[PDB]
Ligand binder design. Sequence first.
Ligand SMILES: CCCCCCCCCCCC(=O)OC[C@H](COP(=O)(O)OCC[N+](C)(C)C)OC(=O)CCCCCCCCCCC
Ligand SMILES: CCCCCCCCCC(=O)OC[C@H](COP(=O)(O)OCC[N+](C)(C)C)OC(=O)CCCCCCCCC
Ligand SMILES: CCCCCCCCCC(=O)OC[C@H](COP(=O)(O)OCC[N+](C)(C)C)OC(=O)CCCCCCCCC
Ligand SMILES: CCCCCC(=O)OC[C@H](COP(=O)(O)OCC[N+](C)(C)C)OC(=O)CCCCC
Ligand SMILES: CCCCCC(=O)OC[C@H](COP(=O)(O)OCC[N+](C)(C)C)OC(=O)CCCCC
Ligand SMILES: CCCCCCCCCC
Ligand SMILES: CCCCCCCCCC
Ligand SMILES: CCCCCCCCCC
Ligand SMILES: [Cu+2]
Ligand SMILES: [Cu+2]
Ligand SMILES: [Cu+2]
Ligand SMILES: [Cu+2]
Lengths: 236, 382, 382
Amino acid sequence: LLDKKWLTFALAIYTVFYLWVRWYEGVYGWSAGLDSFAPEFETYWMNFLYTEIVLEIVTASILWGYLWKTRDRNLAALTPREELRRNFTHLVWLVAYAWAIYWGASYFTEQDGTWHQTIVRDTDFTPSHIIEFYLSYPIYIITGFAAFIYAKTRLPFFAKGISLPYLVLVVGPFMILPNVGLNEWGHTFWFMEELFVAPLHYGFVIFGWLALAVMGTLTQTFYSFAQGGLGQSLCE
Amino acid sequence: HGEKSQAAFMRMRTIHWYDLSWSKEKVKINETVEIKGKFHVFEGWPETVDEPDVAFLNVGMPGPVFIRKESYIGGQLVPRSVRLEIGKTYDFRVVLKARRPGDWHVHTMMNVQGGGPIIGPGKWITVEGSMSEFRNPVTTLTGQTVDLENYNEGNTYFWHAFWFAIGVAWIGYWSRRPIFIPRLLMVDAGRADELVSATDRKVAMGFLAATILIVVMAMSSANSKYPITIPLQAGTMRGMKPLELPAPTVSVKVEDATYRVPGRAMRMKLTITNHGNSPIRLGEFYTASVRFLDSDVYKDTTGYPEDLLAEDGLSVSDNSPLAPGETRTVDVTASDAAWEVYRLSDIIYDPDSRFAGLLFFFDATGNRQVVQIDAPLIPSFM
Amino acid sequence: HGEKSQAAFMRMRTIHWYDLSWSKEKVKINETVEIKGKFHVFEGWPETVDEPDVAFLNVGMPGPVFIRKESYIGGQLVPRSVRLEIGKTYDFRVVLKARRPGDWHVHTMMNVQGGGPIIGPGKWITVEGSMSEFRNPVTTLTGQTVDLENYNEGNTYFWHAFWFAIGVAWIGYWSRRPIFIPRLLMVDAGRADELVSATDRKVAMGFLAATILIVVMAMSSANSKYPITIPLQAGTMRGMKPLELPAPTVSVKVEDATYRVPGRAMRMKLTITNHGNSPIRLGEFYTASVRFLDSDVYKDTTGYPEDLLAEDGLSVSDNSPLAPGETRTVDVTASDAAWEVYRLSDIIYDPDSRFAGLLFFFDATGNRQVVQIDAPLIPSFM
Ligand SMILES: CCCCCCCCCCCC(=O)OC[C@H](COP(=O)(O)OCC[N+](C)(C)C)OC(=O)CCCCCCCCCCC
Ligand SMILES: CCCCCCCCCC(=O)OC[C@H](COP(=O)(O)OCC[N+](C)(C)C)OC(=O)CCCCCCCCC
Ligand SMILES: CCCCCCCCCC(=O)OC[C@H](COP(=O)(O)OCC[N+](C)(C)C)OC(=O)CCCCCCCCC
Ligand SMILES: CCCCCC(=O)OC[C@H](COP(=O)(O)OCC[N+](C)(C)C)OC(=O)CCCCC
Ligand SMILES: CCCCCC(=O)OC[C@H](COP(=O)(O)OCC[N+](C)(C)C)OC(=O)CCCCC
Ligand SMILES: CCCCCCCCCC
Ligand SMILES: CCCCCCCCCC
Ligand SMILES: CCCCCCCCCC
Ligand SMILES: [Cu+2]
Ligand SMILES: [Cu+2]
Ligand SMILES: [Cu+2]
Ligand SMILES: [Cu+2]
């Protein structure tokens, strides 16, 4: 079996959900979504914010708790074929994390830029941010934490210790979410402008760099892949 | 649409827009709508807002639903940022061409280099038609007429696609062979020195030489075609001509100003001294895009937005004609639902509870005097 | 000599120098040459140049071929930086004493605290004699006359040579013994602790004590001699008196201004309205150190530099006398080789294609009016 069709679902769920989110914001961007004090904004975007925050907290709790509860206690007696299967599953998790990171840190963040050059900022909870800071960032945070937990609880290579590159790759991008406090503070007190390259935004830049720990993470996963099922073929 | 969120005192004391007019309320695609009026820079400019040494006359709209054909501050075109003087009154004019169908709330705004956006009154303008009909023809000094909607689009697409294809070709050439784990193991276990051998080096030399040559030849070709180019034109424009308004013949002293918390009314006591030689009557109080009118004195006929206009929102305790030379003290109440809808009552949250506004006095002949008032605004709870 | 490189629009709109005069064209060593004139600060000061809040009246010359004896802005001496107001006209005067023989291009320049050098017209001044004849006597408030060419030179040489000799003595004392490789090997192989032993420590103590004592005694001696000293005198000088020029009786509106690319001519259309009570005629257009004159109206007699003067470089379509009250529109062409020699045609490279200049109108009696013009400058290619 080895690599199964979970990869297709991992790609498709993010693609479909984010395409629907893009449709939703293209429909309710203007027309209940420009004025932050209109009653329709509260029903179409504040309700969206509340629902998504509750659902994100619940989903994170459920997913992380399930992954930690179903953790492999007897990792010592694990066959190499099953290790290869689990390595492929962890690679699927990493693919999902990469897709979520793309959607969160590129698509909706530069989309926040479109909005932060076309309309006058009205609040800290515009549609663009709600879709990005409080939906896509928590989604990729959940995916990254789930991937880290799965690696630690199923892969013997990633067990018996916390991987430093994996921890950086998982936590640094998370630090962008609390960095939103600097974004709002730096937009209301600092910089009475919409400059996208202002120093108020280097917080995302600093913690966007920490996603480069994916290189150390990926060489660690390559070594985990090539533990028993390394060969032969390769290097022979 | 970005106001009702800015501090009420900041909206009250930045820039006062008056004599606003809109040429049309409903336009077709490619039709022109002209926005005129005057804006006055408040003398008590808030200290956290930089003085309008560098200001830009902008339009508040949801993206390019209109294109700004022209904009004038003092009769002359202002495509760049301008310098405004605190205390001066300027007349402006913005010309917009309809581009996208729909109902758009068009604001006249001013952006300041160190204080952000100062949004004026917004008016709903309806655009009808189709976006496909929109044209933006421009004639260049080289003698060619181009449409700015699609000019250079094909060239941009071609060049970006070409360079993307070059990069993809490089990556794919290296990706035909196994990529990650065998190469990692070969580099780890002993010297690698086998994964990069000719003609890989020849291919890299070819890629480098071709890239440099293509860049050079493309630059030369883009020099031959379009032989006449200019840099981006930029720079703050000084010498904005202000209006030479006559000195007002009405002097108003504000003796305390209060607003109930909660409430939709603002009350102030004014000592009005009528100089000149005509009996005057207070007809309007404008504070922040909100016009409180006394219907018995003045009626609005310029199509001001209904949500910002209070036809009978101004009540004067004694609004009988004020004879010249006579000075009297009256109680003026400015009450309208706009005071709460546009959050002018949120000044209680502001760290500077002071207000500014415009008073308009009309005589029998109808000619009006613009007198400017500002005072601390004291909330009342008991 | 540092101009012809600055942006043409920056040279056109920073400072307009006019009424310039030079007392002498050829001087001997120790002789004085006086440069007078007026400079006007342009109202449309470019935004990337800081306002002349701190400005210094400098002289453009290849080093101290002259010494600046005196410089005045408004009649009073200005050895320090000064504050200038945008839009004001100041008269200046610089006195130079010849120091070095040769042919020197002397410019009158102004340095701005945030915009760099504003170079005015330069004139070739010949200096004859020998540099050995130059004297710069100065009388101090303590009652002694010194020559600034060699005052304190011997003392400076002595002290620097003495301290250099002390340092060389220290290094040589340590350099008598073997220096690098044996000492490196001794420090490496086991403890060194043999290369520094008494009386090396005694010599170091002596050097330290002697250095401190010599510094203290030298300071005390330099306190006894020259008992009266003052700190360096510095600080921007405010309150520069500007000229009280009468309001011009000529109003000129610029309706478009064009220059051919390539070309040596600049063409503009002006609507001149003659107020007052005298028929006027346009005689000169000054744009950036370049004077385009109409020989039929005005002739230069102040010895203006030939490369910057166009005796017949100004052509007016209708330069007949303009009766008072009459307004007419004329086509004015300013053509001279200076327009290309001083790269005023390089404004096409500038990011702000706008020009400024001075127009001089003369009546029958000869008295002149200075009117200032500025407008966008549009290149023409076809
Ligand atoms: C990592 C864990 C993430 C947790 C957060 C998830 C956020 C989900 C969206 C919040 C919606 C909200 O809050 O709004 C509720 C909206 C408000 O729209 P309405 O006025 O009812 O109009 C009619 C509804 N339309 C405008 C959408 C047509 O209505 C709803 O009930 C519908 C919400 C559907 C969400 C599920 C579909 C997602 C795409 C399919 C692939 C997964
Ligand atoms: C609406 C939310 C639905 C999320 C569904 C989560 C699925 C449960 C997670 C999980 O444990 O594994 C699912 C798959 C297949 O891996 P499994 O083998 O099931 O995982 C356990 C490994 N073990 C069987 C050897 C013990 O592993 C995967 O690759 C699934 C990737 C799912 C993409 C991440 C979605 C997260 C959105 C917030
Ligand atoms: C918010 C920012 C996160 C800060 C980063 C700190 C965590 C980084 C290191 C890390 O993840 O290790 C914690 C464990 C991994 O196993 P260990 O750290 O070895 O300890 C396991 C026992 N423990 C679950 C009680 C911790 O991983 C888990 O066991 C997590 C799964 C259990 C938590 C599920 C409940 C959470 C619901 C919201
Ligand atoms: C790899 C990222 C792909 C992002 C594509 C995207 O944002 O799609 C939205 C956009 C919306 O434009 P349009 O297709 O015209 O449909 C408009 C519907 N709304 C307004 C809701 C977006 O176009 C599509 O939906 C094309 C489908 C691409 C599938 C990968
Ligand atoms: C790594 C490079 C950081 C350089 C910081 C920077 O560009 O700041 C510009 C800003 C100058 O403000 P300015 O660009 O004039 O802002 C104009 C808009 N307002 C007045 C509303 C802020 O300076 C500061 O206020 C100090 C920044 C501290 C950085 C740790
Ligand atoms: C207004 C001047 C701002 C200067 C900022 C300097 C930033 C340097 C970062 C090390
Ligand atoms: C090392 C490559 C340098 C290329 C220089 C090309 C100059 C062309 C002038 C138009
Ligand atoms: C440790 C050496 C301090 C020297 C002080 C000398 C003071 C002299 C006063 C004129
Ligand atoms: Cu609006
Ligand atoms: Cu005002
Ligand atoms: Cu020179
Ligand atoms: Cu001038």
